[PDB]
Design a binder for this molecule. Structure first.
Ligand SMILES: Nc1ncnc2c1ncn2[C@@H]1O[C@H](COP(=O)(O)CP(=O)(O)OP(=O)(O)O)[C@@H](O)[C@H]1O
Ligand SMILES: [Mg+2]
Length: 443
RNA sequence: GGCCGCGGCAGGUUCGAGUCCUGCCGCGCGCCACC
């Protein structure tokens, strides 16, 4: 359990076994075979072309390079055409930039179209940097392949690996750049401890400077932030892990933790013990790609959260879950119930024109003077968070994100109490409430 | 699809809204995710 003895045992988890590598090379051999027959200009990129892919996470990426003059429509129609021709079984589901996800001799293959650029300054597609990424990295990353795998494994084990909106973490390319800049996994951990939200890491200049935000400058484009989608919270979650790790190294930092089945009874006691209002918004999952869904669940969850605050229900945290058929928006509030009366502010006693208008309004109770101005008692239209959210989600469905809001329009329901705990949201609830010992890394 | 802006224009809430909530339109090949 010394710092180096643990990195040894951890390499056994992040390094692909030779049986998997062989499967990769065989699929690569057949992939090159089919591509050459089509006479298309291509290149192998990604974690496979640099031998930095994690054990069990084998995926081959193949870029097809087309002329610059090609329309975005022409890039798509030709890219997919080649893709489908090369893959055994394929599947086309993307958010913006078209590509073909499929299989070849049993390995994951992605056939991505892009523009054959010279100098990637003002890229035309979103992925035009990826070939230049590989050209820059192949010569510098050599020998350090396992140092990347330790970092990728360290992050993946703590659920902050991936730049996708489902994660808002560290892209696989960002990890490689960090190894080139620090030299080893251990040197990234040591230094990361003293990162701040202002940290700038310009790899191309071998410099660390201060800035407006966290910013890892892309060697290929000095305007591009490689860590653009890394949330501030996930940045923090990473820094915290590094301080903990150096303070007390362990193999558990590389073991993937998984949720535990919590009894609906134990959960009922925890919420009762807290005396909070725990409820969820349930609706049909819109049939869209994850990268459109999660930004919208974030928005919807926030709009309702903000609503609960200004309505004085004092919300603690928000959360959401996406099962296969349904989406859930969870909320916890300190106020299970509020009074119906509240005090609305009136005008100062001086200017009677406004006061006369104010006191003319028919109210159930008599208004009063306080510290020099008039006040009135008025009634709330709802007295619980559940009743409030029912109203907001009903009327303001449209502001909760395009697809989520339209799905909430057609149907939603507020689930509370024991009926909630029987829903696929236990894991999310335990995280939200800070429930202890609802996780394990047992194999 | 989400996000950040420069503008706006109306509508709602209110004694009172450039200031809180909402809708619509313009313009930055604006940024990010899908590799
Ligand atoms: N969000 C992002 N930011 C910067 N570059 C990205 C990126 N997503 C993809 N890329 C580029 O596309 C290449 C491969 O992308 P992916 O296959 O999706 C992850 P990877 O690099 O293969 O690591 P991984 O297989 O361990 O997940 C990367 O080398 C990178 O150059
Ligand atoms: Mg890959």
């Amino acid at each position: 359990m010394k710092v180096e003895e643990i990195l040894e045992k951890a390499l056994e988890l992040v390094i692909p076994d030779e049986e998997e590598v062989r499967k990769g090379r065989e699929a690569e051999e057949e992939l090159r075979r089919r591509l050459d027959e089509l006479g298309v200009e291509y290149v192998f990129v990604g974690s496979y072309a640099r031998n930095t892919w994690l054990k069990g996470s084998l995926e081959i990426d193949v870029f097809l390079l087309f002329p610059e003059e090609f329309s975005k429509e022409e890039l798509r129609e030709r890219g997919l055409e080649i893709g489908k021709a090369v893959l055994d079984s394929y599947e086309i589901r993307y958010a913006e930039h078209p590509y073909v996800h499929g299989v070849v001799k049993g390995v994951e293959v992605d056939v991505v179209p892009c523009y054959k650029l010279k100098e990637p300054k003002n890229i035309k597609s979103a992925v035009d940097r990826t070939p230049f990424h590989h050209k820059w990295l192949e010569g510098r990353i050599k020998g350090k392949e396992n140092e990347v795998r330790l970092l990728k494994g360290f992050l993946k084990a703590n659920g902050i690996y991936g730049a996708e909106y489902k994660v808002r973490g560290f892209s696989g390319y960002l990890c490689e750049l960090l190894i080139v800049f620090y030299g080893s996994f251990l040197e990234t951990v040591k230094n990361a401890r003293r990162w701040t939200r202002r940290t700038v890491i310009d790899v191309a200049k071998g410099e660390v400077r201060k800035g407006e935000e966290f910013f890892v400058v892309d060697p290929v484009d000095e305007k591009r932030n490689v860590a653009a989608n890394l949330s501030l919270d996930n940045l923090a979650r990473f820094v915290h892990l590094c301080r903990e790790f150096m303070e007390a190294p362990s193999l558990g930092f590389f073991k993937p933790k998984h949720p535990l089945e919590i009894e609906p009874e134990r959960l009922r006691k925890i919420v009762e013990e807290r005396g909070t209002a725990v409820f969820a918004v349930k609706f049909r999952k819109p049939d869209i790609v994850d990268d459109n869904l999660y930004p919208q669940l974030e928005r919807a969850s926030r709009k309702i959260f903000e609503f609960l605050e200004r309505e004085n229900f004092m919300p603690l945290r928000s959360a959401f879950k996406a099962s296969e058929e349904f989406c859930y928006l969870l909320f916890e509030c300190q106020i299970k119930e509020i009074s119906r009366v509240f005090r609305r502010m009136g005008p100062q006693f001086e200017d009677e024109r406004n006061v006369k208008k104010f006191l003319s309004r028919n109210r159930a109770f008599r208004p009063f003077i306080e510290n020099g101005r008039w006040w009135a008692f008025e009634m709330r239209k709802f007295t619980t968070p559940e009743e409030g959210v029912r109203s907001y989600a009903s009327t303001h469905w449209h502001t909760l994100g395009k697809n989520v809001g339209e799905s909430i329009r057609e149907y939603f329901e507020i689930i509370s109490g024991e009926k909630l705990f029987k829903e696929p949201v236990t894991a999310e609830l335990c995280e939200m409430m800070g429930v202890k010992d609802s996780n394990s890394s047992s194999v």
